[PDB]
Design a protein around this ligand. Structure first.
Ligand code: GOW
Ligand code: GOW
Ligand code: GOW
Ligand code: GOW
Ligand code: K
Ligand code: K
Ligand code: K
Ligand code: K
Ligand code: K
Ligand code: K
Ligand code: K
Ligand code: K
Ligand code: ZN
Ligand code: ZN
Ligand code: ZN
Ligand code: ZN
Lengths: 415, 397, 395, 412
């Protein structure tokens, strides 16, 4: 059973932010126009029995004071009058400004992603779905008491918290977004049962600045009982589908062999696409060379582990919809063993005109030694050996070796 | 609203240099130990959407090859290998050597201050704040293609170039050293008037900002637009205040600036290891710096306050804590009571052995300069068709 | 109409190189001796408003540091002194050495072909001409940052890039003795520019590509199956060459339906070329060159005709004069009667000792290549969702 | 007496081309708005008594067939066959020199103004005459070029140089090499041409620079050494450009002793021209233009001043309005004070956002000097004197260059 989070008020709320506009509607309507919706079990967003139980949900991670401020910020923007000087200072103390502005639905918008991702986690826990997709979720930058990068509430941390708290349970979190998932990584920095792994761009001045090097420089990788449980693969700009795929594949499989997660949570932000306005990575949604996204999603799904698939970044809205519609059809193929054929021409529906000038499903893009990252593979596998050692897990050197030996790189695997 | 630039990562990068060590952490911890942070609006450092975007922002002043050299220098110092002869040559052609050495975070360190001062300028432009403080910035010696005086990227030039493009800007440089990089950058520009007061003497860094014999003061349309007041060693709070006060008043009258940018280098302090001037951080005579910031703040012009020099780190923290409280008093009106005793906190033991907020100090050529400077202001107002009562301004001296 | 690139400055620049000498003058002056210029529209070479504009045009394909190196190489050869060891290393790193030497005008000479071929692309685009000829152009071996085969700037790539950015699909046909690797390489990832080169290929023969690699490479990414090659053994004649390429040209037209055709017409396949590899002629009773040009022109697609190789200068002039007259005839519908004797003119002595227009010459593997190429065409059209009658093509 | 070519029909024709639009109207109206017109003697464009007299005037330089084709192109646009297309392309009546309804009247008008201006110099009615509708220096005998269809400079110089020992000095300040004027007089020693310009690979028109060590061609036959060229790299400012041509101009005046000077004063060297090559200004406290014009007028030689290029139309008018006031000042000895604010007139709105007379530009600065060109040029000047049997006043030329410290560059 493949689940997906949708609902009438859920779509209105998801589409009510100044930065993301109607992106969620495009995604779900393109999925709908390709007739995928009948294949999928609709997962209704969680609702609560009182503000108290809701406040209790959100404050499992977020400070009560930051939640109150996020609520006040919404009420303020729904009245005509301006913020007082004290209002200003309180919002700034929570970074409720600049790149995380207030707007009339900012709290309802932020809560909706939490409702969706918590409901998604619950459908996995009680084994109603093997996989659940939430294209309204994935806000990986939000901190305990800080908004960041248009992330006001961290649905991912809250969904993971519910998975680990369900009745030796380990979660593997995989962050494919163009940006470092600092918010998820920071929340579980001291926790061995949530192993985070983000692949991303990092360069000086690039948001948010972490997920890379810090006497020679070093990678911090978690602390205390969490030492070695935070993994990062920072990559230079310009990477294509094959090199990104080759970069994370063996790492993904090695993490799965050693962590043995009970659940996998995948943040699947689409700003790595070549046609994203960031213009940094050069990934595609192509499907016969092959989209590194689809390659990674197919590999994770092959592990047969209950999985949550989340959205995230993606600022070319039509191309984000093209990629996540393919990710959704792939998930249906892999889980249900059911062939999903997707016509190259965008079907008739009410957002058809946004897919111009081509109205095709492939993004409108033409892909065209020394850039290798074998010392990162070696660093990360030694980190994996340390994690297994510190947590007294089996480390199957032979299985990890054979994997990397498929690409002639067994010599990077430590014993 | 008074803004102050800070962040976790930004504090980490400002404290990673060999020459300024942990000074920014002491400054921001004394400000916080005095409960000033709740009064202040946190301004986060600017971040960019791509490498191309950051490069576009920095080569708005610096040359691309100088930026590549500086980033190359960081990568080399993040390896264990010694530089090749060819790479020593490349770094030497950009003065990335001697007093501007490489170190493992030299590029992130340099850029952090640009991020800090660019965000501060943006906050003033969209009118989020009336004043912004950035104690991690103020690197006034860097040139387009050249490090100098431990300044690798000129965050002041970039911030001024952002304000003057949103309009005249008055730049005020209180540092012991001449602000030559800022003055050079706007040498041909009438809409950025620069005014530096400083020590100058034969062989004293950087060597400019004095008689050259006659005084140079801008070129092209920017003629008469760079102002300089050099002073002999030994000057105290009151004489320094009296030498600078009338010049500040006359520039504001005649120029009518849209923004004021103040470099507030703390190496004029009597306890700085340069031991050249005798300024204090006393708020009752009155500190030269506090007198100056208060006057500039009296103008109600949106103002950037930046750091700079200052090599006695606890006394720089003592000076800039008072400047921060004063800015809060003058902008919000909210009286600021600072205990004379250093509050307990992480760095409390650095403020030994006395743990007082006051620094531990026991306290004609200028008239000829005033004559010449007023003549140059008159010349500037002439050339730029500005309207001013030459008699009200003449009365200021 | 039919356009031809020329100009006095252009002619002086195109004749300033050590390797092709005054070939361009022989070409253009045989064309004039035969009273063909009044039938042709003169296309002046493009000129730019500033150094920056010239640089923006040329670095559409070439790297800036390569353009910088090329202009520095010209300056150095206008000085008396030797190059420094460091300057030699610099030029080596862009292969500005050996068969791509410096000389006093190497940059102005190279750029002139770009000026002519861009002006010719533009005359096609605004529709002033149906066909344009540039016998000073056709330097198909230059790469993004590398001279090769006396090609310093790839004028074809820049012309083709101007035509595709004017949905536009361009067919490039390369009849030169050598594989057009630079043009092929430039559009390796692009399905909108389909490249077809026929050439000699054999072990050790320049530049090495355009043949079994074993299998044939033919493009990558969305350009897969979009680079076509027909390598041929030495000694082939007009009729075997014609039968070899004739069906491939027709099939490419039917299936790609190109918006423009760009034809490189290097004359080093001639029997009398000092390469002495192919046995093609300039005979119009039939010259393989005239057969292919006439086939290509019968398609009525706006067409760019370019020069290229050709190292027997009077015999290249004989072929290119016949190509020009034929293009006039095929386009305007108006017979062009060319005397079998060379008319008198400034360069008449070069055509001795017989002074005649005909060049002085007495005149299954391919089935495997046709089946390979027909299958690759099918893969191309299928990958590009182009509609076409497979059976009509296979005939 | 300073003359200026103007007339009602003349304004209309000069304003009727697609490429230059109303540029001539902004120029003359700004001169008018600064009140310079009463100081100037209006010089009416020349008219002829028949088509044949007109055609005789124009074919003193241009071929019969090129003029005939140019007339046809204008008649054609007032209503093309494939042979009309071929005919026009044989004269480069295409691309950068297209046809338009008035292309012949437009082209003829500049001839009419420059010849009338020459005539006013010849008969001593004026010491100097300005024509801002003229200066089309690229047009060839049988070829339109660079939006020049008829070469009014060539025809004007030919009238001067044949009026009753007579030599003309032609000075071309335009951004571009004056190829059309240089080619016309290439075999003639009595018209000495000097062009300063940008030249670089691919920049129009390509001549006026280097051509075994490369060489400068400089005339042929009796005209050997009579064509001077100074090509400059991009970025030159008012002072470097002033120092580059000042001494060459003074030396040319000293050695050649011209009876008339003709100055093409094309404005595309302005920093604000769309070409963005040179960084000249119109500033006047110093503009290289105003510097060079002041220097030429100080020789007290009857002088014709022509327009040319200039594709920022308000800034072209700001330059040429200053050139006009300075000519009045230098020739009549009469102070011409021009206010910094553009005066009120129908085109006032075209000088925004500043509405000031100084162009809106901010200037800002061994190995970029051109002292070898001075040496090459002074040697060519000495060769011209020899060939033509003129006195070469070494001491005066030397004293001239030793003002800068460069006497050592002067040949004996
Ligand atoms: C500023 C920022 C911060 C965070 C994220 C993000 O998606 N993180 O996962 C994205 C952004 N990017 C943007 O807001 C953006 C939008 C359009 C063009 C370029 C950039
Ligand atoms: C060498 C130098 C260069 C520039 C600046 C400066 O602060 N410029 O604004 C300061 C210095 N001074 C010093 O670095 C210094 C440090 C400790 C004791 C004495 C001097
Ligand atoms: C070495 C080379 C490289 C490229 C090309 C060429 O024409 N490519 O299109 C031709 C050559 N051939 C020659 O340069 C050559 C010249 C004369 C006699 C024999 C050979
Ligand atoms: C193509 C041309 C040809 C000749 C001349 C010229 O002024 N010669 O004196 C000028 C040009 N320049 C231009 O036509 C031009 C116009 C506007 C912007 C950029 C360029
Ligand atoms: K990521
Ligand atoms: K963890
Ligand atoms: K100072
Ligand atoms: K200035
Ligand atoms: K070929
Ligand atoms: K191709
Ligand atoms: K000129
Ligand atoms: K001459
Ligand atoms: Zn992102
Ligand atoms: Zn200092
Ligand atoms: Zn060849
Ligand atoms: Zn010009």
């Amino acid at each position: 059973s493949v689940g997906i989070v949708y609902g009438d008020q859920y779509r209105q709320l998801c589409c009510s932010s100044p930065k993301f506009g109607d992106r969620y509607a495009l995604v779900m309507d393109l999925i709908n126009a390709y007739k995928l919706i009948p294949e999928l079990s609709r997962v209704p967003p969680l609702q609560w029995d009182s503000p108290s139980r809701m406040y209790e949900a959100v404050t499992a991670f977020h400070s009560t004071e930051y939640v109150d401020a996020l609520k006040k910020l919404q009420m303020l923007h729904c009245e005509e009058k301006e913020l007082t000087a004290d209002d200003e200072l309180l919002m700034d103390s929570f970074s409720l400004n600049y790149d995380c502005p207030g707007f009339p639905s900012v709290f309802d918008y932020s809560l909706a992603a939490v409702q969706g991702s918590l409901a998604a986690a619950s459908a996995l826990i009680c084994r109603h779905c093997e996989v659940v997709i939430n294209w309204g979720g994935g806000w990986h930058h939000a901190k305990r008491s800080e908004a960041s990068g248009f992330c006001y509430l961290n649905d991912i941390v809250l969904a993971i918290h519910r998975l680990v708290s369900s009745t030796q349970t380990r979660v593997l979190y995989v962050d494919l977004d163009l940006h470092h998932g600092d918010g998820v990584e920071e929340a579980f920095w001291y926790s061995p049962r949530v192993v985070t792994f983000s692949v991303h761009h990092a360069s000086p001045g690039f948001f948010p600045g972490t997920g890379t090097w810090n006497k020679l420089p070093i990678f911090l990788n978690g602390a205390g009982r969490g030492r070695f449980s935070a993994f990062n693969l920072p990559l230079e700009e310009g990477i294509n589908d094959l090199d990104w795929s080759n970069a994370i594949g063996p790492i993904l499989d090695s993490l799965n062999i050693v962590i043995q997660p009970s659940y996998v949570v995948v943040q699947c932000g689409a700003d790595c696409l070549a046609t994203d306005p960031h213009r940094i990575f050069r990934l595609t949604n192509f499907y016969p060379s092959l989209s590194g996204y689809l390659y990674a999603i197919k590999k994770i799904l092959s592990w047969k582990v209950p999985t949550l698939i989340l959205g995230g970044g993606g600022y070319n809205f039509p191309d984000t919809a093209r990629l996540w519609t393919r990710v959704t059809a792939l998930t249906i193929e892999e889980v249900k063993g059911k062939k999903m054929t997707i016509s190259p021409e965008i079907p008739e529906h009410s957002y058809f005109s946004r897919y111009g000038p081509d109205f095709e499903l492939d993004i409108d893009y033409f892909p065209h030694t020394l850039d290798s990252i074998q010392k990162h593979h070696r660093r990360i596998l030694e980190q994996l050996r340390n994690y297994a050692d510190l947590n007294k897990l089996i480390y199957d050197y032979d299985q990890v070796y054979q994997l990397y030996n498929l690409t002639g790189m067994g010599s990077l695997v430590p014993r």
